[PDB]
Amino acid sequence: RAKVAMSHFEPHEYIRYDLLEKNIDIVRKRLNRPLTLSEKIVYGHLDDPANQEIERGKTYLRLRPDRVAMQDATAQMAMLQFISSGLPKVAVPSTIHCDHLIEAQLGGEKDLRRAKDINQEVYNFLATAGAKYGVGFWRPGSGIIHQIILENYAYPGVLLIGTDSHTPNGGGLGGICIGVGGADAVDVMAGIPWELKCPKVIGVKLTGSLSGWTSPKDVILKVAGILTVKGGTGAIVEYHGPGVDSISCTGMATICNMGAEIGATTSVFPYNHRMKKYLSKTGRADIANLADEFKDHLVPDPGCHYDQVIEINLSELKPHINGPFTPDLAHPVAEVGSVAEKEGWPLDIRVGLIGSCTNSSYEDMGRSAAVAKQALAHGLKCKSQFTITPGSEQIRATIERDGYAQVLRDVGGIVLANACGPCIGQWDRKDIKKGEKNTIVTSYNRNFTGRNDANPETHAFVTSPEIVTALAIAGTLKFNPETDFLTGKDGKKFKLEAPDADELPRAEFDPGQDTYQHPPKDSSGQRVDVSPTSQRLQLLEPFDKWDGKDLEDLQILIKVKGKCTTDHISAAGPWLKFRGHLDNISNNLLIGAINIENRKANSVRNAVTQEFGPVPDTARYYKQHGIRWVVIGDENYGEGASREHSALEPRHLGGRAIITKSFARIHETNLKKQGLLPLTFADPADYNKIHPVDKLTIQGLKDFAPGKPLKCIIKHPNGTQETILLNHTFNETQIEWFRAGSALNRMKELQQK
Numbered sequence: 001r002a003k004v005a006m007s008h009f010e011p012h013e014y015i016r017y018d019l020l021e022k023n024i025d026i027v028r029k030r031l032n033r034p035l036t037l038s039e040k041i042v043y044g045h046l047d048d049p050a051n052q053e054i055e056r057g058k059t060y061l062r063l064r065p066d067r068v069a070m071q072d073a074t075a076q077m078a079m080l081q082f083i084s085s086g087l088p089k090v091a092v093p094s095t096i097h098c099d100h101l102i103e104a105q106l107g108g109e110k111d112l113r114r115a116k117d118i119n120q121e122v123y124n125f126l127a128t129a130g131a132k133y134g135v136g137f138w139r140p141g142s143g144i145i146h147q148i149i150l151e152n153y154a155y156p157g158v159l160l161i162g163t164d165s166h167t168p169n170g171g172g173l174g175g176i177c178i179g180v181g182g183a184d185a186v187d188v189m190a191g192i193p194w195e196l197k198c199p200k201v202i203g204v205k206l207t208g209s210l211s212g213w214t215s216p217k218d219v220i221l222k223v224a225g226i227l228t229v230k231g232g233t234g235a236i237v238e239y240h241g242p243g244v245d246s247i248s249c250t251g252m253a254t255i256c257n258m259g260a261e262i263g264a265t266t267s268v269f270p271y272n273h274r275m276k277k278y279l280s281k282t283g284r285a286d287i288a289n290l291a292d293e294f295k296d297h298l299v300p301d302p303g304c305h306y307d308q309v310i311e312i313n314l315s316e317l318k319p320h321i322n323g324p325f326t327p328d329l330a331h332p333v334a335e336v337g338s339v340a341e342k343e344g345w346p347l348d349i350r351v352g353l354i355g356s357c358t359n360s361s362y363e364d365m366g367r368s369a370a371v372a373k374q375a376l377a378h379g380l381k382c383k384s385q386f387t388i389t390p391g392s393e394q395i396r397a398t399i400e401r402d403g404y405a406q407v408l409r410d411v412g413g414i415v416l417a418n419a420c421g422p423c424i425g426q427w428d429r430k431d432i433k434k435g436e437k438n439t440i441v442t443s444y445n446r447n448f449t450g451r452n453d454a455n456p457e458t459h460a461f462v463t464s465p466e467i468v469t470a471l472a473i474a475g476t477l478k479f480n481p482e483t484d485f486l487t488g489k490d491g492k493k494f495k496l497e498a499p500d501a502d503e504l505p506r507a508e509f510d511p512g513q514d515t516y517q518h519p520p521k522d523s524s525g526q527r528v529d530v531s532p533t534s535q536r537l538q539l540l541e542p543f544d545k546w547d548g549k550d551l552e553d554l555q556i557l558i559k560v561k562g563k564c565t566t567d568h569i570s571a572a573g574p575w576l577k578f579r580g581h582l583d584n585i586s587n588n589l590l591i592g593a594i595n596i597e598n599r600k601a602n603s604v605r606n607a608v609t610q611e612f613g614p615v616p617d618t619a620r621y622y623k624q625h626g627i628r629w630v631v632i633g634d635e636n637y638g639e640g641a642s643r644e645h646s647a648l649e650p651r652h653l654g655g656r657a658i659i660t661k662s663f664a665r666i667h668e669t670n671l672k673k674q675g676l677l678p679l680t681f682a683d684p685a686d687y688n689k690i691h692p693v694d695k696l697t698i699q700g701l702k703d704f705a706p707g708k709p710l711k712c713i714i715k716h717p718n719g720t721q722e723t724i725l726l727n728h729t730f731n732e733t734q735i736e737w738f739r740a741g742s743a744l745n746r747m748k749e750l751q752q753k
């Protein structure tokens with residue numbers, strides 16, 4: 001048909017809208033009903049469209065994704081697992097992005113230089129693994145992974161998977177972009193089918209047009225407060241309505257991005273003119289042109305059934321600000337100054353932070369700049385500390401050139417390197433002592449306890465870049481930009497005008513410096529050296545196969561109460577240093593969870609010694625002595641980041657099973673991949689029958705089966721037994737992973753030995 005290539009860097013890899021079409025057609029013949037946009041792209045990508053059983057919320061689809069993307073903090077373990085497979089070359093276009101390890105301290109060029117020195121060992125291992133398996137590499141300084149994908153790799157109709165939970169960002173350009181763990185991405189780099197449980201679809205209908213201070217971030221801050229952190233679990237969010245055309249392509253990216261915060265498999269928009277415009281301005285005008293010929297399969301079918309519909313009138317929507325320690329606690333900016341005051345949240349703002357993959361684009365930077373020049377016109381500068389992260393080299397080079405970066409500098413801001421930085425806690429914050437209670441306002445997405453500075457008493461509120469700017473100028477949460485009056489230098493009271501700004505540069509985008517490094521697809525005659533005495537990298541040893549027996553007299557390591565995020569299970573910040581060393585990173589296991597016995601973080605009873613101590617050391621002690629253990633958690637366990645370390649670490653320290661009232665998706669998949677047993681209570685009130693002193697026997701593992709529950713004998717210390725039933729979402733493919741000890745031990749048996 002046409003030969004239009006997937007990117008400027010793979011000129012030989014072509015977009016298959018013909019294959020999409022062929023399979024959407026086979027599927028709609030079988031179903032005879034309207035398909036939504038997400039069903040078309042997803043079902044369009046099935047390995048077997050004539051035979052696949054499709055039932056939303058029930059069947060597991062075996063899919064063929066178009067590309068794989070990884071960032072430096074999760075690419076390490078994903079590549080160390082690819083090296084154990086023993087396969088020579090990745091089978092689909094794959095990329096590594098070096099965005100997570102650049103700590104913020106001094107600002108821009110300085111922080112990058114110091115990071116290239118400190119992280120040389122790791123960046124070197126990724127560059128060599130890259131050259132060898134044929135994975136493209138974006139060097140430190142290039143930008144935050146999702147801004148680089150939308151600028152170079154995302155198009156209408158792509159199915160892209162990535163080792164980072166905010167990969168949905170790509171829905172701003174009409175693809176199905178989905179967050180996964182390192183072992184899922186190894187399957188796809190290895191060329192085997194990827195499985196996804198078939199999603200429900202929540203249609204959200206946008207009406208009106210946004211006006212003034214309201215921006216794209218307010219739509220997803222309000223959707224989050226309406227649907228809550230677990231309302232999107234098992235669903236794709238599918239936007240539609242007349243209001244869509246009012247939103248920029250990067251603002252659509254913004255909204256798809258933070259759908260991660262309601263547990264959604266991903267979010268997506270239909271191909272329209274704002275997207276076409278952006279493809280053309282990022283040199284992919286031929287992809288805009290080919291999407292016009294395929295437009296019917298890149299929009300939803302007339303009258304498709306959504307499993308839930310929600311409607312938002314953009315024109316009625318006001319400025320929002322969410323948190324303190326969950327992103328679905330939504331307030332209007334006009335009332336946050338009084339709830340905080342009622343609730344005891346601190347009112348003076350210490351630091352205001354714009355950036356992250358949710359809000360770091362050319363439009364975000366210019367809208368922020370426009371509040372800042374008004375303050376400058378009255379001789380005012382930031383009363384809070386103000387830091388600014390650009391999303392990529394191209395945005396850094398271009399806002400510099402269009403004058404924005406200098407306006408933001410003149411009000412008192414520091415421009416950091418194009419990296420995550422403060423958002424995964426790679427910040428060297430020294431204005432507060434730890435445990436000092438304070439307020440930081442960000443334009444980020446998560447605001448879980450201790451995540452930006454490892455201080456639990458930091459109250460972080462997430463919002464939009466123009467509201468962060470306005471409030472940093474004011475220095476207080478009691479300030480509504482829309483109503484209130486600042487006082488200039490001159491003695492005159494003035495009020496801020498709502499910001500106006502271009503969505504893309506009028507001129508072309510200045511590209512900045514070279515940051516991409518292509519694989520030699522020639523040479524690749526590299527050796528990947530991992531020093532055997534290294535502290536940051538260590539090769540893997542397989543896990544144990546299942547011994548054919550049931551799990552008797554298991555010890556409860558911890559029974560967790562409340563919210564247990566993957567930032568509570570495996571902390572980030574200073575622990576990023578060890579993302580390539582399983583034994584050294586296993587020392588943060590569960591140190592942030594609250595134990596129900598004492599309401600304390602990292603303080604659990606050792607069953608043997610009866611002394612209370614750290615969770616890592618207690619699990620190593622149990623392991624050392626042959627005690628197999630279990631974790632009992634509450635609802636929506638594993639909320640957050642997709643880091644597979646949160647499942648690798650309990651397996652490394654002797655953990656056998658995890659039993660919760662519900663799981664967040666990616667974490668449940670990550671636990672089955674590593675040989676553990678994620679199990680749910682068939683009755684959630686059974687959580688109250690189990691006490692940390694009891695021993696549990698999981699029985700009937702020998703005739704393990706999809707749909708059939710397993711029985712748990714809660715042995716109470718007094719001799720009382722009790723049976724409860726525990727359900728599991730395993731299909732027979734997954735049961736082969738557990739029997740073998742892990743998906744990777746299974747993939748290695750199938751290589752005929």
Ligand code: SF4
Pocket residue numbers: 144164166356357358419420421423424445446
């Ligand atoms: S949420 Fe923060 S840490 Fe995660 S990719 Fe976005 S910017 Fe980096």
